[PDB]
Amino acid sequence: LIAEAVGSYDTMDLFRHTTELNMHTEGALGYAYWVCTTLQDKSNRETELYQYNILQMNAIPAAQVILNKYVERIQNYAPAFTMLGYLNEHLQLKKEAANAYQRAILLLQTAEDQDTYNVAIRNYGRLLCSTGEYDKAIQAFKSTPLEVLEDIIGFALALFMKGLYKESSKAYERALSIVESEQDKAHILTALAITEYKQGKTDVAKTLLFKCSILKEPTTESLQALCALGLAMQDATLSKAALNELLKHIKHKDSNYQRCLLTSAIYALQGRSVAVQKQISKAVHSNPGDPALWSLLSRVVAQYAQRNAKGGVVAGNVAHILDSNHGKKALLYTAVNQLAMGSSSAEDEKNTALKTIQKAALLSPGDPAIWAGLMAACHADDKLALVNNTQPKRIDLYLALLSAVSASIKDEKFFENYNQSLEKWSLSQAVTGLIDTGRISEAETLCTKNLKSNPDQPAVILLLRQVQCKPLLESQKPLPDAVLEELQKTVMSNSTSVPAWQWLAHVYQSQGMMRAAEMCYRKSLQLASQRGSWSGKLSSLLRLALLALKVCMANISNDHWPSLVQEATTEALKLCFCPLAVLLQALLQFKRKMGARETRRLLERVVYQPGYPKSIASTARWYLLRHLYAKDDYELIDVLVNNAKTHGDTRALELNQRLSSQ
Amino acid sequence: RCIQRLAEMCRSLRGAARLVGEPVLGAKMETAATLLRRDIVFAASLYTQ
Amino acid sequence: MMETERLVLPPPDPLDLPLRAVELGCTGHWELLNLPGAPESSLPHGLPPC
Amino acid sequence: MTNQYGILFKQEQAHDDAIWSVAWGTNKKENSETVVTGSLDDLVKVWKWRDERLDLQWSLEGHQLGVVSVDISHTLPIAASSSLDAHIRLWDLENGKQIKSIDAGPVDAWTLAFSPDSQYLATGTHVGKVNIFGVESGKKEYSLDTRGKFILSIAYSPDGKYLASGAIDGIINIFDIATGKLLHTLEGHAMPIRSLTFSPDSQLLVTASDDGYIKIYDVQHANLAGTLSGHASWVLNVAFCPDDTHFVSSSSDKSVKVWDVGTRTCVHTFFDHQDQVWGVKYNGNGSKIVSVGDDQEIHIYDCPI
Amino acid sequence: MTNQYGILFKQEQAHDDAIWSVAWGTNKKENSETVVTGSLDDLVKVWKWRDERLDLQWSLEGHQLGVVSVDISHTLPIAASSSLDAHIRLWDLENGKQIKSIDAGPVDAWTLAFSPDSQYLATGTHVGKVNIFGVESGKKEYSLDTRGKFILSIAYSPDGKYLASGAIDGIINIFDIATGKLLHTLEGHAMPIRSLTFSPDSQLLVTASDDGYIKIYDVQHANLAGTLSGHASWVLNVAFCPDDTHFVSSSSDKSVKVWDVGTRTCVHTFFDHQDQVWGVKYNGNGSKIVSVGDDQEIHIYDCPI
Amino acid sequence: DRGVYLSLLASLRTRAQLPVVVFTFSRGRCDEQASGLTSLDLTTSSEKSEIHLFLQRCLARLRGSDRQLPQVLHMSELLNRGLGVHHSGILPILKEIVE
């Protein structure tokens, strides 16, 4: 106290020492006052007074605990309550700050009635509006003279939150009347544009934002709103101008992430869809720190141009490494990228898709994406294990995951389109998984329950068709044209979806309508190519080639299927280096005019050049062994035997044993 | 031996900085001590436990 | 819809192998399964929306 | 002036992947000293600290996905574990064979906790409730309800009559088992809680949230006695000493500190792990510490009484 | 007749998007003068200086994200390129056939530079390591390690036993290759570095800053013997010439300035490259200058010895 | 001195006067003859096994880099044959093992 009276410089430290000794009341109030006063002065945050003391001795939490003890001890003094509210506001404990201000309001009614009571009212109302309870905020803002900028602004924002947009516009206009500090005028103009927009009436918003732009110096706030308004519209012409203006003469913005997002969104608007990733790559090159940028690069590569899966995986891992609290999003994006990749790895444990998605699920079990990712991971793992042929695992858990997805979605604020898409996708994947595992009854009941909710939507009915027609066509059976026509009608209902069409063509192939199945595949290929998608195009093309080759296999006449095979394989090789396509060409040549030289050469080069999958190599090896047996050369046969030995094989050598002694 | 004889003084100064009334030396001496002793320099004795 | 039927010999040759095409991921990576059966694509409905 | 702290044993690779929870139980009246640990696998390996070292005893497994919490009981030989697999199958710990299996998904259970008398095995759901099952007697007698968000941590006062539950977004709920009526709700932190623990004699509740601070509340009122801030990242578990004088806290900054509640200060810090430390516990008469970590290791420390 | 610096060439569209790394190797004494560029695509293109111009030889690719740095080796004709996914390729530079594909972890390698005898290929790492991958024979031969932040740019000494490595925080560390013992640490700046270059007969070390300043240092000590304040915006790359007379600097304000050691003043500035310039280089003598900008234009200037 | 110590230990091992405590008077002199002696192997097979078991159980608590540094390896090599040093220029964790 003596040091404070004579105005020294180490009074704050003396109060801190007193706080550390034994919690007396007077020292408690002194320390809280000094912490709040130090926080006010905004020329401090390089001094090593503010930085060390406040941010490295955890002054704020100590002050909060001290004030709680003091306030419960005395509880008839208002400034203590207001100081407690202020500190709680800096800790983002908003509910407790609201309680503190409420008690301060109760204390201060019948003593002063001056500005202090009004300021306490505005603070309580503002904070109450910050966390729900908008009607209470409006009621509190009623009981004050709405004559200063602060109260009017708080009233306006509470009104905007509840609705009543016209009222908010009027309140903001009144606040605009009494304005100094032109920065605030620009902010009020931007708020006007934002609030009136939600009514519609976009043109007045646009012109008003230009009116704000005419001020002496831009504010870095109105420009961002202008760009977002352009994106809410289409034809991003003003948007480009706004972005250029923002970059030109504004450098004091220190986010560096919002600017990248706006630039990427602008490029996405024109449908370019590859530049986006290039631009984000440029931004991450500029500032190789800032994990957020690496994470956003991973997300964009996952969404747009999903052919750089390896780069995306690396970017997500780097984003995760350089910090910890970005764990959630970076792990989610790397898991999805690994899903997209496939299994192009060294068959290493502890780094498959399942492991990373499980890690993310443990980090934040709140968002709805992680659970859908988990379902996709389980299905992909099942298929991969089936290919390796050891054991299918993780059989029956889909229903629980779907329930988790829906329950998590229920608490999400608003991304309406995104939430609808997520729920729909989870439903579709769960039904398909249940159909695959073999639990037809549960899939059927789930679909019926979903359809009972609402009138028909042409997507779910196709799922019900799929569950119905799985038992039959499994065992060979002949179906009547009525059922076939209804299924055709159902697929036609919901078009612009390559899966459905491919599945129906598979149905045709199963019952047997070859040319018709070829037509359905051709329609699917055209749809995929027109969509700008890339996986669907190749998938449809290779599937059609397989269809033609298999139907030819039976040594059928009408030698036209090989021509279709030739055309499809040429297109596939034009796009990429599909090993299956080249093996398919070799098999077609071998089947038609079995012959001696060209077929053997192509097969042997295929089975000798490295960089090929195991199964395709095995198939080519086995057929070449048969052809080599046809055109006798025992040396080469022993060459094949040793080639089998230096690897692991069961069937090629076994056939060789079978046919060495016929 | 020198580091072991230093970590016993950067902890006896924590006892005096609280006594003089210097709450800023305490928050530095309880860091310079916990930041100094981690490994084979301070490995526990064998015939002690 | 023109043929309405196809009659083929289902066990044409017992020496040769039926071809099973399994698709893994959107970036092109196919493999050949041994046992005959359905097309068996992975992630039929596409990537989960992040 | 502090005690003699130091390592006693170091297992090199217990599991093949991260270890997510650990439970130490000196359950039997004789000298058993059983440690049950679960990881990012199906394995629920059951170790035994025999004389100077850990010897693997059981390698039991029945799970499909990684286990997120495991538990042991002090009265009977028993253990329980839950995972992302939507199953709470509880093992036998004597023959290494499964006893039961309860179906419950991430909307019905996240983390386990037995009763003080090993009868009820409460778990925290997704929609806010706490579901209390019945061991050896079936399923789902009753669920206490707090109108909130996802619930992460569940604790029991070791004399009955109190149940605590932290949640995502911070708020804390204290129920009394006698009537099942919410006494009072603390508002606590601003980020998820993911660890809670009462103290022996059940008059001091110690939280550990996601921002780095460790509130020390006080039960039967809402008084808080201080905030312990000495970490540099998330705090993932807190285990309170058998005598009401210390507690151990493990953070995601690769360091397991041991605080004491009398003066709210950190006595000794352990810098021995190389990655996040997901689980710490004491033993019986508390004189040894277990810390299982994200890197596959099981550390056992020496904290003299 | 005075021979003044002349523009002497322009190549309108070298690549399809921004250009980031340029290397000029007069490796072959015959008329090869191969120049190789990396340009934010998969493509990395090899050009040769035939008589007075650039005639494309081949463009070779395979890279996930944009390429950041390329280097050409003096001893053998061979090239090296690193990308954003930390994945390094070695190019034969006689056929374009990708002799080797040195992999790297999620955080292994950012930029590249060969050993004088073409043996080591030193490279930085996002978390401070300076690990070195022996060329064509070995992988992760050894890793010189320090404690510090991101390491953008790597220098290397011509004679040997010196390796200067800038960091994002703004500090310079020089390590002698003999044993790995940091010679002395230069405090430097408070902003990133982005380029470090030695001299032939390596006695002077030049550091480029992100504040627009350029610093000249003496290797035998920490003598900050210079400070240059001509560039308005950032400085991205600085190179010498085979004699210790003058150097070229490449700002981010679309200007390339040629400074001189003798008087420490800007003798000349060039005005092209509407977009910022990211690379500059000198040929086998002091004659010719190569500049590659953010705009898809290659410029070749002239400056007689 | 190298011949002096190998002749002393040669005349000492012939008898049962084996557990000999050499007193040197400076740590460089102390470590010099222990480095230079370099071949006795005064230890049988089972005592080698017991020495290795005890020394690995006590040494395996601490971390990786901390158990591979010059003194630890060199001293373990000396102890395997059955020779030890106990001067003041050694880590405190090795004086206790030697004692």
Author numbering:
A (entry chain B): 903 to 1564
B (entry chain A): 1198 to 1246
C (entry chain A): 1 to 50
D (entry chain C), E (entry chain D): 1 to 305
F (entry chain A): 550 to 648
What do the study authors state?
The superkiller (SKI) complex is the cytoplasmic co-factor and regulator of the RNA-degrading exosome. In human cells, the SKI complex functions mainly in co-translational surveillance-decay pathways, and its malfunction is linked to a severe congenital disorder, the trichohepatoenteric syndrome. For clarity, we will refer to the human orthologs of the yeast Ski complex subunits as hSKI2 (SKIV2L, ∼137.8 kDa), hSKI3 (TTC37, ∼175.5 kDa) and hSKI8 (WDR61, ∼33.6 kDa).
Two-dimensional (2D) classifications of the cryo-EM images revealed the presence of two major subsets of particles. The subset with fewer particles (∼40%) resulted in a reconstruction to a global resolution of ∼3.7 Å and showed interpretable density for the majority of the complex. We will refer to this reconstruction as the “closed state” of hSKI. The quality of the cryo-EM density map of the closed-state reconstruction enabled us to build most of the atomic model de novo, with two exceptions. First, there was no ordered density for hSKI3N (predicted to contain TPRs 1–8); the N-terminal arm of hSKI3 was thus left unmodeled. Second, the density for the hSKI2arch domain displayed a local resolution of 4–12 Å in focused refinement; therefore, this domain was built by docking a model generated via a structural prediction based on the yeast ortholog (Halbach et al., 2012; Tunyasuvunakool et al., 2021). We will start by describing the closed-state conformation of hSKI, which is generally similar to that observed in the structure of the Saccharomyces cerevisiae ortholog (Halbach et al., 2013). hSKI is scaffolded around its largest subunit, the TPR-containing protein hSKI3. In the closed-state conformation of SKI, the basal surface of the hSKI2cat domain binds the hSKI3 solenoid at the first and second superhelical turns and hereby interacts with the adjacent hSKI8OUT and hSKI8IN subunits and with the wedge segment of hSKI2N. The hSKI2arch insertion instead protrudes from the top surface of the hSKI2cat domain, extending into solvent with a curved structure.
